[model samples]
Target: IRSYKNLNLVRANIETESRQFIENKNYSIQSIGPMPGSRAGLRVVFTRPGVNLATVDIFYNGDGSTTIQYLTGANRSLGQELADHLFETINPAEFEQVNMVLQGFVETSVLPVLELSADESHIEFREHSRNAHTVVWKIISTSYQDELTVSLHITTGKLQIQGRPLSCYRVFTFNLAALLDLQGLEKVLIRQEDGKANIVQQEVARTYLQTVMADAYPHLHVTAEKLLVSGLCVKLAAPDLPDYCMLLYPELRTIEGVLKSKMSGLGMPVQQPAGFGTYFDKPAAHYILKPQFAATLRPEQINIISTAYTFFNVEAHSLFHMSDMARLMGKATRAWGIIKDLYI
Candidate 1:
């Protein structure tokens, strides 16, 4: 809707009330005449002191109309609030196209932890900031306790997520997309840049799994890598786990006829959905009658016995048969053995 008839008067009013309109922040509002061929409309640009880019812009038409432009390349909240004051109406900044789609996708897929009924559940998304081709958002998940701060690159379908380790990958296990389900998310890539390791016992578990595989599967090659939330991933396949699984959940080897032998978080605090030795890791650790477990001469820095007990408890539910129990216990005991060994 139009606010004032004369653009000059609007400019004058803006300057006079600029101090009263903007508080506790430094702002520079500049008014320029209309383009050479265009009809009369003043272009007012708002910028922070030392910042080169325009925070926001408003086109005040001579016929009492206004067009507000949210230059989201930086923090535009101050400028936007000023625009609202002058226009006497508050307009919220919109999420970028990629974020707009992602908000709906994430919110719809994960139910809020608090609410059971869909009607009662709500995942609120707040825009933290935006760059030239990316938008940062703080997602309040009703499903997970921890809030996730994710940035989406518009041109590249890359998502950078930051949150606690436990809650971060918990939501992803069910919602991870293959290719087409999530539009433009086919090239999804996630890497941990932060130096903090997810779980201390994970390295111990990985070392033990690799050691066991090496000892038992002398015929096949065994390689290991750190996975999300879980522990170490021991693989025997030529091509490692799928790109999607590797990034999101390394322990995800349930793909049919794909992974030959993979030892997933076997003796870790958090248990995988499927029990250990179920997937082929070469000949499968459980298949071997007497699997040699790694025993460290020195004591581990962390309590290896405590970690082993935790692993045993989490993995117990997945085991049914007596043979399976021994297989899992051997792996769990092996993980404990290395924890003390690695300490030295």
Candidate 2:
């Protein structure tokens, strides 16, 4: 593929198309000939036509191939459509690798949305203009794929074909019987970002998740932020409910190296499966109590509960004897109470 002349033509093609876009607005695209022995570094910035503005550092090799150069030490990403056009125009083969790996975001984007068998489903977007606004579900490659957009529409608090409300996660529960006709998602991506993720360095993402998702809710609410202190009961969730149960008690003098007295009779902890705790946060303690209840609260603002989750306690069959409709609520409720008092 070492057609040096071919490289020039390809670069010219990219520059021509790109400038038309740039002329349509205000932006920048940088392309230059090789420095001495180095390959020419050409940048064809699409600007999402008008959506993003990170500029560029996409390097073009002489053989119609590209290798992404870190732009200002910042790992910039390109929209899939833009990436596809750039690489494929230069070389179809390069696009394949771009989508397969993060060579300048040839395919740096991905989603974790469990691809639902939505044979009957058709998704689309309408971003009429810039600031007109628009905008991964799993870990799944959305490279050249539409999964991320699909999930974005889904969590947008509505499942709409276009502007029509197709599925409502909020109403789905309240009107479960009517909602039965809707599409049910298999994976539980509590965070929308989790649903569609990109190459976020773990530390970078965690700081963000802890800051944004901090509690279980991602904070973005109906035209706003959680804006308040929201929650999760890990001791209630599997993460550490057991320890949470123990932690719930300000004082649990271990007896016979066995358990002690909770407001209710205490039980033996199970073998750590892969390992876990009630978390007192994702909440595993009273986890069974409100087992189906979860909410998207705006901890950053006044918590306006957007949705409520309800899971059928299949194991409701396994009853805790002392479980009082009220008294047992103490032990179950304590699961989160410990974290409320502690899990930070």
Runs in model 2 deviating more than 4 A are 1-9, 24-37, 43-53, 69-84, 88-344
lDDT of 1 by residue, 1-344 (tens): 43322222234455445456544355665543443355443344556677654444455665444555544435565556665566552211111012222323332222332121111123445678878767666656443333556666665655555553223323332234321121222222223122223324555655655565454323322222222113232222112212222231232211110121221222322223343343213242222211322232113422343343344323322221014334434554454343333222
Model 2 agreement with the true structure over 1-344: per-residue lDDT tens digits: 32222222244465565456455545444433333345566544334344454444456655554554424222245433344344445422222110110111111121111111121123222222222112222111112222212222222233221111112211111121111110111011111112212222434433532454446334223211111111112112212111122221111111101111111122223232311123112344232222222232224211111110011111111210002223433643432222222212
Taking every candidate in turn, the Cα RMSD to the unseen true structure, in Å, is: 19.1, 22.4
Q: How many clashing residue pairs, candidate 1?
A: 9
In model 2, how large is the Cα lDDT of residue 85? 44
In candidate 1, which residue ranges exceed 4 Å CA deviation? 1-132, 135-145, 156-158, 163-170, 173-210, 214-344
Specify the highest-lDDT model's number.
1
